[PDB]
Design a protein around this nucleic acid. Sequence first.
RNA 1: CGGCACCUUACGAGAAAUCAAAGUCUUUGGGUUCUGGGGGGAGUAUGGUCGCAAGGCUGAAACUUAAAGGAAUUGACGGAAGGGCACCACCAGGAGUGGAGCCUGCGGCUUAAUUUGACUCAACACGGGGAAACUCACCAGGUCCAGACACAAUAAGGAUUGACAGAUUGAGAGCUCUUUCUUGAUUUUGUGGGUGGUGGUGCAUGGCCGUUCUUAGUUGGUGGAGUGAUUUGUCUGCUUAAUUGCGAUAACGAACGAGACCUUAACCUACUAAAUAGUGCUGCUAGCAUUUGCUGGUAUAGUCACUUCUUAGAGGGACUAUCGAUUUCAAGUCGAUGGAAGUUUGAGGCAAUAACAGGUCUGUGAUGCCCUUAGACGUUCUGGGCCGCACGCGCGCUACACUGACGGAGCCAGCGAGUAUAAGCCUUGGCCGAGAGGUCUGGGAAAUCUUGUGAAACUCCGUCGUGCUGGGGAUAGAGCAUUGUAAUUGUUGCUCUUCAACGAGGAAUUCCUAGUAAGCGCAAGUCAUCAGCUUGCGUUGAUUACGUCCCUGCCCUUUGUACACACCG
Lengths: 70, 57
Amino acid sequence: GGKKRKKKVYTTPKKIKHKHRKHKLAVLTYYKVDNEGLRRECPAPTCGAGIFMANMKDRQYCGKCHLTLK
Amino acid sequence: IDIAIRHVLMRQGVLGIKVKIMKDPAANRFGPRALPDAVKIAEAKDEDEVIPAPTVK
RNA sequence: CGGCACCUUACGAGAAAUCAAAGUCUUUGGGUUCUGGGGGGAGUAUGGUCGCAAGGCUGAAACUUAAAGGAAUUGACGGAAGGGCACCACCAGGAGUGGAGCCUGCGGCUUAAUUUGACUCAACACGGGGAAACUCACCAGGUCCAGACACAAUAAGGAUUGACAGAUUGAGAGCUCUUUCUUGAUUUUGUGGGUGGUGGUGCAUGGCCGUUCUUAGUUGGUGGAGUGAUUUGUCUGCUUAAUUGCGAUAACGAACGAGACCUUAACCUACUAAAUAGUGCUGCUAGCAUUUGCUGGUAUAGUCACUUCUUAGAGGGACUAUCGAUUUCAAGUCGAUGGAAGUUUGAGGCAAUAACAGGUCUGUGAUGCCCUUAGACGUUCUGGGCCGCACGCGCGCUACACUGACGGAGCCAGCGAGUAUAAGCCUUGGCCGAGAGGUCUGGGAAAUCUUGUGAAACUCCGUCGUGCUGGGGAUAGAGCAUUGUAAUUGUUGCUCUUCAACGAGGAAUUCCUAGUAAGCGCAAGUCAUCAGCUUGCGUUGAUUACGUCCCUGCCCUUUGUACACACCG
């Protein structure tokens, strides 16, 4: 009973999940150094220091705090 | 009559078991002590000898 | 002495049926003739022979085939016989159904899908299946792993987790994409292997349920019969609702089923009690007539009494009791009388042995095997479907009117159910609203409140006046409310308007014997909402039997059988 269960035909194309993007040694380009001598930081009371924003279209956004300014 | 029914798991399929055990009515401490149609008649107290008519004041 | 036979026995014979020969036959020999050697082909072909002919006599082979056949046993069946029985049978009848409109299920057709099981009784208001979402299994799409655990790999200089803004999507799914941010060894990937599945198989199963069949039926021990399968027990007659009894008896004693039993209804001025039942009195008091009367309210502190009515433990009562009759005069049966009750007093629950390829894998974290398991047949969300309509069918509800419809008035049950920081129960009373409904209170986890559930049929007084009529109210337009996240494919309720078919239903066919049938509502189940359905409950309350075996079947005996897949042979 079930009439030779249908063998699926897919109108849409095969779809691909998302892996995690890579970024070699992120802390290297996080910090700036000069010899013999940096994006921004979330100010929310959730985390505090040690969280970096990004540079989108003149916009900021962290990851450990889903908040945007300006 | 008390009854127990169990399922038995076998490699080929389930086996069912039913056990029925009838107990002795005379050994029943809860409800009736005999079957409803079981009739018990007392033994007679007869074949006695009688002395004609004395009186014990 | 001879003859035609018969009855009993069974030493003996025989596969048995049976046999005074069919005995005197493996303990095998009185004389003698004829015939057969698995079933067919076939008493056919051919040759011969007899015959007027029809035919008679003689008489092959090729080829084909695993049985054919005999006697008996148990069952089943019989347009066989004899007994008995049943409103899922009839009879005498009642109500009908079948005809219309609609509700609902089934087929068909359509479909993106219209998920699926079931097809005579024993499928079709059945799956408690009254599906808007969920349910949900189907259809068009989008997520997620909730893939345990052990390996191996990648890899901390990153295994991997999420998510602002856009694009994107039905979607404010970071599903996916540009974006560099976040988090950190629980995870990712390959292997092994798990897990889930309303996926398949009820013809692989357990459990449960239905049916045979709700009739009276079923079984072993020892003994008797038979070479055996089997049989007697378990039965002529009478009797019973009954394999239940009287009895008959190659049995005897037993076991199950029946009956007993349990629940429920009817009686009890007889026990125990009642401030959650009722009452008589008594205060305080009403209206009406004053005889000290008639009808009421009130008082769960009136420091009263009680148990008829109500409630429910603890009992009583019926056993056919008495009397006539009849019959083994045994079992019983029929009339009366008394009785609350005399059909087993009424109604049910329970219910043997053997079975069915009956239904259920879609109740089950009940299950074997198969299938599938990351673009899933797992799960979840959005939307649709299960309702789709030339048509056929089943269970039903409304009707076709005057034994009625409408309007007023009268005004009486019984079984039941009910909640709290809700996802929210039963709702009295007060207020608003034509209604439906809204609002504020208060009672009730309940013999206490809803509730005397003031139910409907019905009763009374009028209006209508024999017509598709004020019968009927399908279909449809407009508006108002309520449940729900969501009412479009009208959820349901209410108001106006619209006002179909139907004039008692062909062949057929269902149910029913007394508080029954029919009519009439009510409560509970399903349930946010919705009952034309089920399960119970009361109200009003009959006509006709109290018989039979004609039809349809059931039980037992005898009997026939070429049946055993059992006469649908």
